[PDB]
Subunit: 109 residues, 3 copies
């Protein structure tokens, strides 16, 4: 049909510039239809025996399940951290016409 | 069975008034139990031969799977773009009383 | 290398509740990692009117396994008596991150 299986991928980054550049390569390389950047996140995790807290930005990446591999590759290749967060969540339904656009926007995999 | 299959729906909108109103209109019309508005989000995508970027906000809408078509029709009717982002994600539980109030406060 | 995991959305009513609940969450070994999204605005129906209040959003990355522990932990340290805690199924990613996620949390 019109309309490949899709996902929403969260990826966090340390700063504003990083976020904007990653969104550019993702979209230019045609690995996602669309990227929302949520600025001014604060992140909390346990590392080196204390609780750590860092200023970060969240990228919300609408794309194909197909490309989750090409995407995840791509985030690591382009990312200040060694273990960069990237997790996909499945899109089950939506505005049909947008999901088609999502398909046409995206690399063939 | 005090609990119906539920979704998180994402909708971007182009400005602060817009989403405030979409949200009002959505909730009023009983098409979702609630809407979180995330403001100041930047959206990047490919459009007319290059990398467009727009200032928007994000509506995270918690409603029932049953209501996704009604909610998607509503969003189109009340939204500036022709092909608005509306995408659904399935909930695999959580606070059961939340999930029932979700059921209850929705049609 | 990798137990079934999830993202958990949870709103708190202010800057401070979030900092504190994110701490106490990560402190008691309950999720690998917590993102606070400040200054969101939450709109819902309540007592016959459209309510709007300012809030924050915790995005909580953990294993399905801890969902209930977590929920029950939040209800303990959460000033609302019916917190929004909903969960969406993680289904893919940095195989590495998922391992770190796994390797940062309990079983029960």
């Amino acid at each position: 049909s019109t309309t490949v299986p899709s996902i929403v991928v969260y990826v966090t980054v340390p700063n504003k510039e990083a976020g904007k550049r990653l969104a550019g390569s993702i979209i230019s390389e045609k690995l996602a239809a669309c990227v929302n950047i949520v600025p001014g996140i604060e992140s909390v995790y346990w590392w080196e025996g204390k609780v750590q807290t860092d200023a970060e930005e969240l990228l919300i990446i609408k794309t194909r399940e197909s490309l989750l591999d090409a995407l995840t590759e791509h985030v690591k290749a382009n990312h200040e951290y060694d273990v960069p967060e990237v997790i996909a969540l499945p899109i089950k339904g939506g505005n049909l016409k947008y999901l088609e656009w999502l398909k046409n926007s995206t690399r063939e995999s």
